[PDB]
């Protein structure tokens, strides 16, 4: 039934060997669980999706890893209720293609579409529209959770069972296996964005641009971000903000099929500085999805009010010797009821660090400042933080652990991450 396999997160670090069940039969899955809750606890069981999480939340070395990608049935889409009803194994790319013809848009998209619905919920993923749409769990209207006791619970965000619902959202698969869910989609008349591009010269004007209230005019906003140049160049950004185009705004060629889809010498001179600023500055640019959308991935958010502390963390980063080219910055909006949900209103930033000597000790310092300044790290990007740091970052973890205690008293569900962060 099972196959012992060598599993890594997307970052390809910290491998561990687990027995991997990979069946489309919801029965075998329910039974493989009781075949684990019968032998005491052992090393338990964790669900796995498309394995895009960099962390170790979808590994369970010496235990059972259940691959959910065979469960990829889209059961129904309804354009009137905007409800979509899918198996946890369907990915967001599959789902986006199926829903477009109904005038429905996936409400939260991450930077890769090869992500299951299970994973989208379990990490409570965010995207470029967080400040307007919240994260993924805000759009889940119901889900079917295979619990440790073998029963299948129907959860909804309100009424009774809300607590277990909101613990499963961002629960990293540690309340049990999500089998099926209903998502409320976002209505759209096209598959296109209208985008305004902006460029900044300093971290100061980047913050100002995100504080002047202009942000309330776009549903989608993010930025490429300079983490290398010394001040005051440091933290200049190419800002890309937009919203879904109506049909009226499409060029005539496209207005027929609105829901479709398919380094030089100058580069560092004053001319390319002129090129980069000119090409990064635009208005009303219509773009499709793909146009608009040995390393250590590191992402954190700092509460909105601690802006000076945010600027200081950026300073620490560029003066650290560790250089990062791909940096995305965004202002998150309001959070949700999930105790372990990563997003809070404030300054979010994703950096990519070339693995080299001293990096591990340096990021441990970074952790310390992020913690100190009231922010947190993201489990879907994280493999190396500590339980003390995690627990302090997420003050509601105790609230969460209790809920999990009820629904899995015998530690049927476990992972490399749960043991490391002491969420088990
Ligand atoms: C290039 C790239 C860009 C990314 N951009 C973003 C981004 O912009 N925003 C963002 O939030 N994230 C981003 N991510 C991270 C990614 O969206 C999340 O880690 C996501 O959870 C991955 O989904 P998955 O299906 O691969 O799940 P996996 O990585 O296989 O599993 C992740 C977690 O979900 C749990 N899980 C999976 N299936 C189930 C289930 N059926 N029931 C219960 N639990 C389950 C697993 O146990 C594990 O804890 C990015 C990743 C990559 C590689
Ligand atoms: N950071 O990794 C990050 C953050 C955000 C958001 F704005 F939502 F906060 C969005 C991201 C995105 O859309 N894509 C990516 N990637 C980075 C550069 C590393 C992995 C590749 C993708 C393109 O990151 C985002």
Numbering used by the authors: 7 to 268, 284 to 314, 331 to 461
Show sentences the authors wrote:
After BTZs have entered the catalytic pocket of DprE1 containing the reduced form of the flavin cofactor (FADH2), which was generated by oxidation of the substrate, the nitro group of the BTZs is reduced to nitroso which can then form a covalent bond with a nearby cysteine residue (Cys387, Mtb enzyme numbering).
Compounds 4, 3 and 5 are the benzoxacinone (BOZ) analogues of 7, 6 and 9, respectively. The BOZs have an oxygen atom instead of a sulfur at the 1-position of the molecule and these were synthesized in order to probe the potency of the molecules relative to the BTZ counterparts. The kinact/Ki values of the BOZs (4, 3 and 5) are lower than the BTZ counterparts by 7-, 4- and 31-fold, respectively. Unbiased difference density maps, calculated with phases from structure models prior to incorporation of the ligand, demonstrated that all five compounds formed a covalent bond with the active site cysteine (Cys387). Substitution of sulfur with oxygen at the 1-position (BOZ, compound 5) preserves the overall mode of binding. With oxygen at the 1-position, the ring structure is more even, and we observe a small upward shift of position of the keto oxygen compared to the BTZ compounds. The conserved mode of binding in the covalent complex contrasts with the weaker inhibition (in terms of IC50) of DprE1 by BOZ compared to the BTZ sister compound as well as their differential MIC values (see assay section). Thus, the structures of the covalent complexes appear to represent ‘inhibitory endpoints’ that do not correlate with the different apparent IC50 values between compounds 5 and 9. For instance, the planes of the BTZ scaffold of compounds 1 and 5 enclose an angle of 15°, with the other three compounds in between these two extremes.
